[PDB]
Amino acid sequence: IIGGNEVTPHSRPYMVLLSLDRKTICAGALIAKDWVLTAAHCNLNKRSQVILGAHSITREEPTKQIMLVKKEFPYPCYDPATREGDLKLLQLTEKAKINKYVTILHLPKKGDDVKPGTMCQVAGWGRTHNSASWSDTLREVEITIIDRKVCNDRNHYNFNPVIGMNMVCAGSLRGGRDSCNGDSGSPLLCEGVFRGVTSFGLENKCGDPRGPGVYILLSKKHLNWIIMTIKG
Amino acid sequence: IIGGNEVTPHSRPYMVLLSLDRKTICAGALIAKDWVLTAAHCNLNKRSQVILGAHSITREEPTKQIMLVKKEFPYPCYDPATREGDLKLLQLTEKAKINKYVTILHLPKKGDDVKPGTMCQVAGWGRTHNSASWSDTLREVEITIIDRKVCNDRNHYNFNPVIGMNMVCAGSLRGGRDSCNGDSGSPLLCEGVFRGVTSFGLENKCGDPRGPGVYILLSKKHLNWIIMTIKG
Numbered sequence: 001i002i003g004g005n006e007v008t009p010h011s012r013p014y015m016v017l018l019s020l021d022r023k024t025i026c027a028g029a030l031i032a033k034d035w036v037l038t039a040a041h042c043n044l045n046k047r048s049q050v051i052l053g054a055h056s057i058t059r060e061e062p063t064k065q066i067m068l069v070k071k072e073f074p075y076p077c078y079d080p081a082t083r084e085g086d087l088k089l090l091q092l093t094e095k096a097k098i099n100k101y102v103t104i105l106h107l108p109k110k111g112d113d114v115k116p117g118t119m120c121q122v123a124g125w126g127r128t129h130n131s132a133s134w135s136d137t138l139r140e141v142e143i144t145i146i147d148r149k150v151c152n153d154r155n156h157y158n159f160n161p162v163i164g165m166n167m168v169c170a171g172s173l174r175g176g177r178d179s180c181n182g183d184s185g186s187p188l189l190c191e192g193v194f195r196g197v198t199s200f201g202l203e204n205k206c207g208d209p210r211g212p213g214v215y216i217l218l219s220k221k222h223l224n225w226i227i228m229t230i231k232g
Numbered sequence: 233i234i235g236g237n238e239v240t241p242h243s244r245p246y247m248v249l250l251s252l253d254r255k256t257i258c259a260g261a262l263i264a265k266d267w268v269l270t271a272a273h274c275n276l277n278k279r280s281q282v283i284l285g286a287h288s289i290t291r292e293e294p295t296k297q298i299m300l301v302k303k304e305f306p307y308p309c310y311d312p313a314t315r316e317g318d319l320k321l322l323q324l325t326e327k328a329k330i331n332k333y334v335t336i337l338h339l340p341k342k343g344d345d346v347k348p349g350t351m352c353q354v355a356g357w358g359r360t361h362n363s364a365s366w367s368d369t370l371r372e373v374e375i376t377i378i379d380r381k382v383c384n385d386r387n388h389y390n391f392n393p394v395i396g397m398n399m400v401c402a403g404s405l406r407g408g409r410d411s412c413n414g415d416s417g418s419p420l421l422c423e424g425v426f427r428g429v430t431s432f433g434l435e436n437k438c439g440d441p442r443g444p445g446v447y448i449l450l451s452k453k454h455l456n457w458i459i460m461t462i463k464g
């Protein structure tokens with residue numbers, strides 16, 4: 001997270017830390033007692049861990065629940081070339097224990113676009129600068145959704161890649177506020193509602209006005225696949 | 233086809249006429265002795281026919297081969313809302329008999345974009361005016377690929393819908409030349425190479441400069457699915 005601040009410990013109890021390996025992290029949302037929604041580009045191995053109720057990565061906390069993946073369900077329409085449908089459901093070996101510290105983030109009922117100018121938040125343990133590594137504590141930043149047509153601009157992504165109807169852009173006109181490396185999978189919250197999944201930006205330019213972070217929209221199509229994959 | 237002309241009978245022997253029902257037709261390409269590639273939005277029923285070696289729809293011709301569908305393989309990533317991946321493979325009950333009149337159109341080796349300004353052709357039995365019904369004989373028109381960024385313009389599709397990296401636009405700056413209703417599925421040929429599949433335009437505005445026809449690009453991703461579905 002670029003230009004955010006350290007969250008009140010455990011004030012975002014749906015946040016999942018994904019320890020992928022030694023060099024890599026990701027985030028995600030707990031969407032059911034045994035389901036984590038994250039991004040498809042986040043590659044797990046057999047040693048990977050899903051950590052619930054975390055604030056600090058390193059510090060030992062009584063609140064933490066270390067979970068294991070039973071099965072990966074990457075979205076079958078994920079296109080690594082367009083970045084389209086960058087979604088993945090992780091089924092856990094056991095159910096999380098819900099409490100004050102570990103909660104379920106609810107899916108939106110309707111898969112609406114988010115209207116430009118809306119204020120949104122994203123939390124994560126990723127880079128806080130375009131250098132170095134992850135943040136030891138969970139941080140959060142507030143961002144504005146940027147009009148899709150501006151996002152596809154010559155002064156923005158400029159069709160490399162195309163920012164389509166199942167993505168939103170969010171940041172600031174002036175820059176300084178963004179997700180970054182290691183925030184992939186993190187839920188985009190907009191006016192209290194789960195709305196997107198952190199996907200990509202410009203390499204080593206988190207927070208550059210040219211490259212507002214791109215979030216996969218929880219649209220009708222993506223919701224259908226989520227609901228189907230869980231229930232049944 | 234808008235602003236085209238009647239083809240020399242049987243000079244495009246890979247062309248498939250799809251008789252979907254009484255009110256509807258489509259086109260397609262014969263890509264193997266028992267495989268037709270068309271568009272996913274083209275709905276067949278049990279009475280539907282795939283006609284090979286046709287020139288006229290009505291007239292009885294010794295060249296015609298009336299084929300039947302064993303199984304439909306609509307592209308699993310087809311999105312009816314974005315029009316994305318509008319592709320469908322039809323497996324035939326028997327093999328076509330290849331001759332002078334019925335041939336296989338070869339897939340491109342590399343799934344490249346088509347560069348703006350390239351001249352392309354599309355053939356079909358669809359509307360020749362923004363009214364009335366199909367053409368009794370196969371026609372063909374030549375069109376130019378329109379730059380993707382112009383296609384997404386305020387004076388064009390204007391993000392309703394987005395014209396993405398797995399679509400090309402083709403028509404003319406002045407209008408008058410286009411595919412139309414009933415041409416869906418027809419192969420887009422560019423400098424001798426099979427390049428796209430006729431998908432959509434603006435309703436009752438075939439040939440309007442605002443809405444150049446949109447073709448699904450035979451990109452790497454789509455080729456992989458085609459090859460996989462056939463061989464195995």
Ligand SMILES: *C[C@@](*)(O)[C@H](CCCNC(N)=[NH2+])NC(=O)[C@@H]1CCCN1C(=O)[C@H](N)Cc1ccccc1
Binds near residue numbers: 039205214
């Ligand atoms: C996997 C995630 O941790 C990470 C989050 C980065 C978010 N960045 C900003 N600025 N908010 N995502 C990625 O690293 C993704 C997946 C792999 C590629 N990628 C990118 O962000 C590339 N920079 C995307 C790209 C854009 C334009 C041209 C080439 C590549």
Ligand SMILES: *C[C@@](*)(O)[C@H](CCCNC(N)=[NH2+])NC(=O)[C@@H]1CCCN1C(=O)[C@H](N)Cc1ccccc1
Binds near residue numbers: 273274392415
């Ligand atoms: C199914 C095909 O025969 C047909 C071909 C039309 C090609 N038109 C031009 N101008 N070259 N395609 C369609 O009818 C497709 C599938 C169903 C919807 N559709 C459309 O062409 C709509 N007009 C697409 C559309 C665009 C903008 C807004 C709403 C719908």
